[PDB]
Amino acid sequence: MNPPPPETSNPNKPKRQTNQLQYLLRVVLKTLWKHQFAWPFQQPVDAVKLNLPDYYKIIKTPMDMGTIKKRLENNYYWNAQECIQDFNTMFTNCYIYNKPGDDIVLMAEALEKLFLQKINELPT
Ligand SMILES: COc1cc2c(c(OC)c1OC)-c1ccc(O)c(=O)cc1[C@@H](NC(C)=O)CC2
Ligand code: NA
Ligand code: NA
């Protein structure tokens, strides 16, 4: 059975809009979302559908771009690093569950390279 998705909105948290947070939604997330290899990462891993009965035994901090999109939208992150950490968690989850050179891993690696290039261009 799948777990509920990660939390995406917390109204009790203070909210701010920042250059970097806008860039993360409007440029970084938008570009990754449209990538050839985006689709596996656009929603939580559905371990039941994908037939990975052990997935949530091994991955205890699931993350995905749908979740990240929501978090940005709901001003869930105070600091840009929180967002960057979520992307890093998503890529690493893939590397952790799978094995070096797996097709899915290569796809994640490609997405990550684009992500890193975009991060290098994050505004001050
Ligand atoms: C976002 O993470 C994952 C997303 C997916 C898969 C997966 O496990 C290999 C993941 O975890 C690393 C996946 C799973 C099971 C399959 O049977 C399959 O054919 C295919 C896949 C994936 N496609 C591949 C491996 O080529 C697509 C969905
Ligand atoms: Na398969
Ligand atoms: Na590519």
Curated annotation (Swiss-Prot):
Self-association and partners: Interacts with p53/TP53; the interaction is direct. Interacts (via CTD region) with CDK9 and CCNT1, acting as an associated component of P-TEFb complex. Interacts with RELA (when acetylated at 'Lys-310'). Interacts (via NET domain) with NSD3, CHD4, BICRA and ATAD5. The interaction with BICRA bridges BRD4 to the GBAF complex. Interacts (via NET domain) with JMJD6 (via JmjC and N-terminal domains); the interaction is stronger in presence of ssRNA and recruits JMJD6 on distal enhancers. Interacts with NSD3. Interacts with NIPBL. (Microbial infection) Interacts with bovine papillomavirus type 1 regulatory protein E2. This interactions may serve for the tethering of viral genomes to host mitotic chromosomes allowing successful partitioning of the viral genome during cell division.
Record protein name field: Bromodomain-containing protein 4
Residues carrying the site annotation Acetylated histone binding: N98
Full-protein positions shown: 44 to 166 of 1362
Location within or outside the cell: Nucleus; Chromosome
Segments forming a coiled coil: none
Miscellaneous note of the record: JQ1, a thieno-triazolo-1,4-diazepine derivative, and I-BET, a benzodiazepine derivative, have been tested on tumors with success. Treatment with GSK1210151A (I-BET151, a I-BET derivative) has strong effets on mixed lineage leukemia and promotes myeloid differentiation and leukemia stem-cell depletion.
Domain of life: Eukaryota
Post-translational modification: Phosphorylation by CK2 disrupt the intramolecular binding between the bromo domain 2 and the NPS region and promotes binding between the NPS and the BID regions, leading to activate the protein and promote binding to acetylated histones. In absence of phosphorylation, BRD4 does not localize to p53/TP53 target gene promoters, phosphorylation promoting recruitment to p53/TP53 target promoters.
Crosslink feature (Glycyl lysine isopeptide (Lys-Gly) (interchain with G-Cter in SUMO2)) location: K57
Effect the entry attributes to changing N98A: Abolishes binding to acetylated histones
Domain Bromo residues, every copy: 16-122
Summary of the tissues where the protein is detected: Ubiquitously expressed.
Record text about domains: The NET domain mediates interaction with a number of chromatin proteins involved in transcription regulation (NSD3, JMJD6, CHD4, GLTSCR1 and ATAD5). The C-terminal (CTD) region mediates interaction and recruitment of CDK9 and CCNT1 subunits of the P-TEFb complex. It is also required for maintenance of higher-order chromatin structure.
Disease: Cornelia de Lange syndrome 6: A form of Cornelia de Lange syndrome, a clinically heterogeneous developmental disorder associated with malformations affecting multiple systems. It is characterized by facial dysmorphisms, abnormal hands and feet, growth delay, cognitive retardation, hirsutism, gastroesophageal dysfunction and cardiac, ophthalmologic and genitourinary anomalies. CDLS6 inheritance is autosomal dominant.
Function comment: Chromatin reader protein that recognizes and binds acetylated histones and plays a key role in transmission of epigenetic memory across cell divisions and transcription regulation. Remains associated with acetylated chromatin throughout the entire cell cycle and provides epigenetic memory for postmitotic G1 gene transcription by preserving acetylated chromatin status and maintaining high-order chromatin structure. During interphase, plays a key role in regulating the transcription of signal-inducible genes by associating with the P-TEFb complex and recruiting it to promoters.
Record organism: Homo sapiens
Family that this chain belongs to: Belongs to the BET family.
